[PDB]
Amino acid sequence: MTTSVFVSGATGYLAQQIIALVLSKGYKVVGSVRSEEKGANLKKLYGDDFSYEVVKVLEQKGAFDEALKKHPEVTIFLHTASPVTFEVEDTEKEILIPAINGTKYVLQSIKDVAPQITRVVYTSSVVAMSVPEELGSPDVVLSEASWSSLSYEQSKTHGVLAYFGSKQFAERAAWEFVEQEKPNFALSTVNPVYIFGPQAKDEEVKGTLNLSAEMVNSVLKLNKDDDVPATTGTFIDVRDVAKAHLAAFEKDEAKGERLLLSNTRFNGQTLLDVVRKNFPQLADKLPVGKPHSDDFSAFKEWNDKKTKKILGFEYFDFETSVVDSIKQVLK
Numbered sequence: 001m002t003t004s005v006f007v008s009g010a011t012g013y014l015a016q017q018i019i020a021l022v023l024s025k026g027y028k029v030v031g032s033v034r035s036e037e038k039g040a041n042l043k044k045l046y047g048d049d050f051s052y053e054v055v056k057v058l059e060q061k062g063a064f065d066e067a068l069k070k071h072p073e074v075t076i077f078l079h080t081a082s083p084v085t086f087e088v089e090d091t092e093k094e095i096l097i098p099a100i101n102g103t104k105y106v107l108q109s110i111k112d113v114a115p116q117i118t119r120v121v122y123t124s125s126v127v128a129m130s131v132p133e134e135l136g137s138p139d140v141v142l143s144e145a146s147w148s149s150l151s152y153e154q155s156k157t158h159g160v161l162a163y164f165g166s167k168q169f170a171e172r173a174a175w176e177f178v179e180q181e182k183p184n185f186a187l188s189t190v191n192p193v194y195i196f197g198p199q200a201k202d203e204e205v206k207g208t209l210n211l212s213a214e215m216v217n218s219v220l221k222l223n224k225d226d227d228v229p230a231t232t233g234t235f236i237d238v239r240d241v242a243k244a245h246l247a248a249f250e251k252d253e254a255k256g257e258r259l260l261l262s263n264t265r266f267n268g269q270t271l272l273d274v275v276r277k278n279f280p281q282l283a284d285k286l287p288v289g290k291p292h293s294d295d296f297s298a299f300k301e302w303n304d305k306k307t308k309k310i311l312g313f314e315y316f317d318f319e320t321s322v323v324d325s326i327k328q329v330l331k
């Protein structure tokens with residue numbers, strides 16, 4: 001009787017938080033995974049309202065055809081699967097193509113075989129809206145209208161620029177598909193910054209230590225003689241990203257929208273100060289730097305007012321998000 005929701009890349013960090021949230025709202029879920037045992041693991045963790053299908057390669061035409069044919073009860077599709085790595089041999093084969101062609105072929109499969117799908121949400125990224133130097137700029141104001149100027153030729157040259165390109169061009173292709181093919185579904189994208197926060201299941205706190213979360217987790221591996229990490233940027237809590245995905249398919253207002261998911265700026269000093277205050281027993285094992293020397297008052301606030309009005313909830317603050325990540329890891 002209830003609606004089923006399809007989530008590509010269900011093994012992932014964001015994807016599992018999305019899955020745990022939608023299951024809690026009464027939805028069923030069907031998740032895609034690159035292998036059978038990967039499916040089997042998730043089933044044990046999430047229970048009866050979760051099914052999976054093995055889709056090993058995104059960059060094949062009709063890759064999701066069989067999976068979708070087997071699940072007519074699915075009316076919602078959340079495409080989150082994407083290479084999220086900066087380190088590869090071929091930027092193209094390992095990052096650009098599976099993102100760009102993966103995305104094109106999923107939308108085509110939905111149109112071909114799942115005409116009952118009314119909503120599709122694509123997980124994009126702030127990298128689709130800018131170039132590396134602009135993000136760390138204090139005179140740059142990003143908005144839902146922002147598009148990266150990074151060219152495809154330049155995106156190939158190395159790993160970080162490939163990831164920037166992958167998101168920008170996959171998302172473009174997504175909006176171009178909607179314009180050109182005129183599908184039954186309405187499209188919306190979620191564009192987050194660095195994603196922090198606890199993993200969905202404690203049992204998953206062991207391997208595949210995902211890039212973004214690890215930027216918090218790595219602090220615990222410092223020792224008192226190490227330098228303050230130089231990591232800096234803007235954050236959003238994984239649980240807020242999940243709620244945005246939910247709003248991205250439940251709210252009429254979210255149709256045809258890009259949603260910029262960005263909260264506050266932080267650097268390595270912000271991180272150490274939070275961890276040191278909340279986990280005093282680790283203070284002797286950690287560097288000190290210059291507590292509260294961090295100052296972001298010169299940075300123009302990004303324009304996410306539209307996203308904030310559509311979402312209609314308040315975000316987890318940096319300390320809570322970081323605190324909950326470390327709590328779980330220590331547990």
Ligand SMILES: NC(=O)c1ccc[n+]([C@@H]2O[C@H](COP(=O)([O-])OP(=O)(O)OC[C@H]3O[C@@H](n4cnc5c(N)ncnc54)[C@H](OP(=O)(O)O)[C@@H]3O)[C@@H](O)[C@H]2O)c1
Pocket residue numbers: 009010011012013014015033034035038056057058080081082083084094098123124125126167191192193194195210211212213
């Ligand atoms: N976390 C961030 O820093 C961040 C920020 C903004 C936007 N995003 C976007 O949101 C998504 C979720 O982020 P995340 O932190 O959850 O990343 P993640 O933990 O690395 O999740 C990636 C998932 O997608 C699948 N996948 C990756 N590369 C693939 C490929 N070449 N072919 C087929 N499947 C592949 C993997 O499935 P298997 O487990 O089966 O390999 C993996 O579980 C990302 O795709 C990213 O584009 C992420």
